[PDB]
């Protein structure tokens, strides 16, 4: 009857390394190989009451007593030095290929049918729209999450590291290539065919991606934030902890991968927000809602089950969404 496989785990393609943060100055970015790293330092914060009171703390005496006991914390902070305005972020991205083949598949015949479905997809249209949109997310510094919302000028350099050496260099403008429009450009198309050859299986693709942001001299840069065990005293509470690898601030790899994943524009809601990350049931953490609900029949699982089990091939945009989820990978199938 060709049912779905119970175990359908997929490996991720487009694996990003941890994005190391350093500090430097603009126009010295052509020689940014010696730049001192951004160090996660500590600073003390004293706070008064700034949250909504639950109708019992709203009494003047209770509120003033809460004011006279301020909440003192220590926060991990990442700031540039006072002579440094440019934040450099470097990560390597490895494009693997073989996105059709699952890592685990209980049903052979289902594995053959899913491989035939991905093969007929690639015979219809190859990894070309998805690689173009992934290359657009490479070109703009969407991996610079909060280090781009107030940046004056952002620049992204991507090198093709074939045999440990630069086989092809690309330089971009991350502010000209916006976070909303998937336009066409010649260098963007060349990076799209490189990611296409990586995703199809034509060759091995490793990309070194370097980002420079005009934040400001001594301004706060925003790395990925860790998780707090909450065991110490309330005075030295350590409310915020940032991520570092070796005395050097960094962004998490899956955050970079999610930002490169932000290409999904074909969700049934309007284009007021723009592209979202390619998740099953199209989830966005900041909006707190799920585009591509299972009720509106545009989630990944319903589209894949129509495409594979009963040969109801969706529109080419939904086919791009399904293949982008297969590139993204996950533990699909019933647990």
């Amino acid at each position: 009857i060709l049912s779905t496989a119970s175990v359908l785990a997929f490996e991720r393609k487009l694996d990003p390394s941890d994005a190391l943060m350093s500090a430097g100055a603009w126009a010295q970015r052509d020689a940014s190989q010696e730049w001192p790293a951004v160090t996660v330092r500590e600073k003390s914060v004293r706070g008064t009451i700034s949250n909504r009171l639950k109708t019992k703390d709203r009494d003047p005496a209770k509120l003033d007593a809460s004011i006279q006991s301020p909440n003192l914390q220590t926060v991990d902070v990442a700031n540039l030095p006072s002579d440094a305005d440019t934040l450099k972020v470097r990560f390597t991205l490895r494009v693997l290929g073989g996105a059709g083949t699952p890592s685990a598949c209980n049903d052979a015949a289902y594995r053959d049918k899913l491989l035939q479905t991905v093969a007929t997809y690639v015979n219809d249209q190859g990894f070309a729209e998805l690689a173009r949109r992934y290359a657009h997310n490479l070109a703009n510094a969407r991996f610079l999450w909060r280090n781009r919302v107030g940046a004056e000028a952002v620049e992204v350099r991507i090198n093709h590291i074939r045999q440990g050496e630069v086989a092809r260099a690309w330089r971009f403008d991350a502010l000209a290539i916006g976070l909303r429009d998937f336009k066409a450009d010649a260098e963007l198309d060349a990076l799209a065919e490189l990611i296409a050859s990586g995703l199809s299986g034509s060759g091995h693709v490793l990309l070194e991606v370097v980002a420079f942001a005009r934040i400001g001299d001594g301004q706060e840069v925003f790395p990925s934030q860790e998780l707090i065990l909450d065991k110490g005293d309330k005075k030295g509470q350590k409310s915020k902890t940032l991520y570092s690898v070796r005395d050097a601030a960094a962004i998490h790899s899956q955050k970079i991968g999610n930002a490169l994943r932000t290409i999904d524009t074909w969700y049934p809601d309007e284009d007021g927000l723009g592209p979202i990350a390619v998740e099953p049931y199209g989830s966005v953490t900041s909006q707190g809602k799920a585009y591509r609900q299972p009720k509106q029949k545009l989630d990944f699982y319903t589209l894949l089950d129509n495409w594979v089990l009963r040969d109801e091939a969706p529109a080419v945009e939904q086919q791009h969404y399904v293949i982008a989820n297969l590139i993204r990978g996950g533990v699909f199938g019933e647990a």
Binding site: K54, G288, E334
Partner: protein, 228 residues
């Protein structure tokens, strides 16, 4: 000696035998499904009852864990200020209209979620009763966490019949619902032997599969699913 079937658990001893000290013993293993749990060496002299009660602790632990693992969500009916909770209802499935919400003085009553990110809806009391009627959780709804989504769907094309283990969660013996085979037969309107063909597995003889309507009505009568 042999495996003891208590709930979905099987206490399977090892075939090999040892003599710790001067007494014989056996490796008894507690299986939840195809997965082992806690394993203890029981002396051969131990009675089957001893074995069962011995592992009863692990058994109870699992049951408690499951209940907590699948505890249903709870919506609070609160006033305009929102701090005071007038009512709490254990929901089966969250409504499809609530969003990021906090009670406003404008509306006297507001429905909110138990979690921090309080998503809700401003409703009156009759709409609160309507929502509580159509989305209440049955008292033993946590067992639906232990059952897969295919055996709980209301659509017959996506419905998969339960196995011997999945049926054996909630039919007889020390089950999670606590009912017996004769009681579950009397709930479904038929005699004990016809339900005993449903309960007993192994070969295809006396292995008639329970129907979709009978399985869902049995889940209704046991208070596990669809019992509002």
């Amino acid at each position: 000696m042999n495996a003891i079937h208590i709930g979905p658990f099987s206490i399977t001893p090892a075939a090999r035998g040892l003599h710790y000290g001067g007494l014989p013993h056996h490796q008894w293993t507690l299986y939840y499904g195809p997965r082992e749990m806690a394993i203890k060496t029981l002396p051969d002299s131990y009675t089957s009852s001893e074995v069962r009660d011995e592992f009863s602790d692990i058994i109870a632990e699992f049951v408690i864990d499951a209940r907590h693992r699948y505890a249903p969500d709870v919506l609070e009916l609160v006033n305009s200020d929102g701090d005071a909770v007038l009512a709490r209802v254990a929901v089966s499935r969250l409504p499809e209209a609530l969003s990021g919400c906090i009670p406003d003085d404008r509306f006297p009553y507001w429905l909110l979620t138990a979690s921090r990110p309080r998503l809700g809806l401003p409703v009156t009391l009759n709409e609160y009763t309507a929502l509580a009627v159509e989305l209440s959780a049955p008292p033993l709804a946590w067992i639906t966490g232990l059952l897969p989504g295919e055996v709980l769907t209301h659509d017959a094309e996506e419905w998969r019949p339960p196995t011997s283990w999945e049926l054996r969660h909630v039919v007889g013996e020390g089950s999670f619902t606590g009912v017996s085979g004769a009681a579950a037969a009397a709930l479904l309107g038929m005699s004990a032997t016809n339900f005993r063909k449903y309960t007993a597995g192994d070969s295809a003889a006396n292995r008639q599969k329970i129907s979709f309507a009978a399985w869902h009505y049995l889940l209704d009568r046991l208070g596990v699913k669809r019992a509002s």
